[PDB]
């Protein structure tokens, strides 16, 4: 099966040529941070590491950082400055991953190196929609007969839509026995969703999260995860309303 590295999406014309030949996924607008469809877009207490502590391998803003424990990233004003290891989303400190074509789920994400447990993979970026916007896109994606869905609940009536604009996190497939999870992090007082490994993911293994999918559509998508505890369908047994799936 074909595979491509994350740096292949930074070349629109090469990517478009690869996509006509089925060597890369279809074109999408690559973004580095969420874009709000409508205009509606804190020091920790870590004692600064000395230069010698940094040389010794000591970590800055590690497991005991008050910002990290609350899933808040540090800013440029962190007491540990440049050494701060709690700015992964801002610095784009992504896991080494590849976009691969799967047998029946479309494109997916795989580990290019062994990924330890609790490793930041990528941020789930996209166009942040309100409920009015979410409903207009529900109608359009149903009209176009789209196979793949890219709506992620963020907060209350707000949804991150990675259908047209996003990054390689939009390729992560569902598994009923997942090896990743979402985590909601605050960066500059703004909520963001990232994917994190839930276990030691060996190199070459596909990265997947439990979508916990709220299906509004009439027909359930069969789940091809292949787990022993497979639920059979993305979205389980019951169908929910467009208002409930949208977070209301």
């Amino acid at each position: 099966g074909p595979s491509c590295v994350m740096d292949d999406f930074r070349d629109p014309q090469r990517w478009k040529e690869c996509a006509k030949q089925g060597k890369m996924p279809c074109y999408f607008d690559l973004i580095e941070e969420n874009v709000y469809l409508t205009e509606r877009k804190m020091q920790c207490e870590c004692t600064p590491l000395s230069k010698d502590e940094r040389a010794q391998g000591e970590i800055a803003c590690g497991e005991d950082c008050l910002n990290r424990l609350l899933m808040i990233e540090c800013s440029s004003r962190c007491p540990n400055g440049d050494y701060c290891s709690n700015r992964r989303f801002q610095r784009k400190q992504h896991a080494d991953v590849e976009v691969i074509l799967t047998e029946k789920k479309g494109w997916g994400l795989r580990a290019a190196k062994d990924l330890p447990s609790n490793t930041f993979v990528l941020e789930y970026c996209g166009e942040v929609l309100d409920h009015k916007e979410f409903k207009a896109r529900v109608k359009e994606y149903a009209r176009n007969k789209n196979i793949h869905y890219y709506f992620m609940a963020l907060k209350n009536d707000e949804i991150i839509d990675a259908t047209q604009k996003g990054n390689c996190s939009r390729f992560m497939n569902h598994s009923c026995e997942p090896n990743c999870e979402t985590q909601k992090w605050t960066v500059n007082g703004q909520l963001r969703v990232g994917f994190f490994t839930t276990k030691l993911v060996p190199s070459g293994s596909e990265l997947m999260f439990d979508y916990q999918f709220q299906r509004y559509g009439k027909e359930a998508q069969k789940c091809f995860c292949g787990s022993a505890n497979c639920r059979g369908y993305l979205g389980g047994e019951n169908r929910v309303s467009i208002r409930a799936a949208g977070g209301k």
């Binding site: 149903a142 997942p178 985590q183």
Partner: peptide, 15 residues
């Protein structure tokens, strides 16, 4: 009458 579609919901892994 969407025949297909839904929303992914964030949640922490627990089981």
């Amino acid at each position: 009458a969407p025949s297909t579609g839904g929303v992914m919901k964030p949640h922490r892994y627990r089981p």
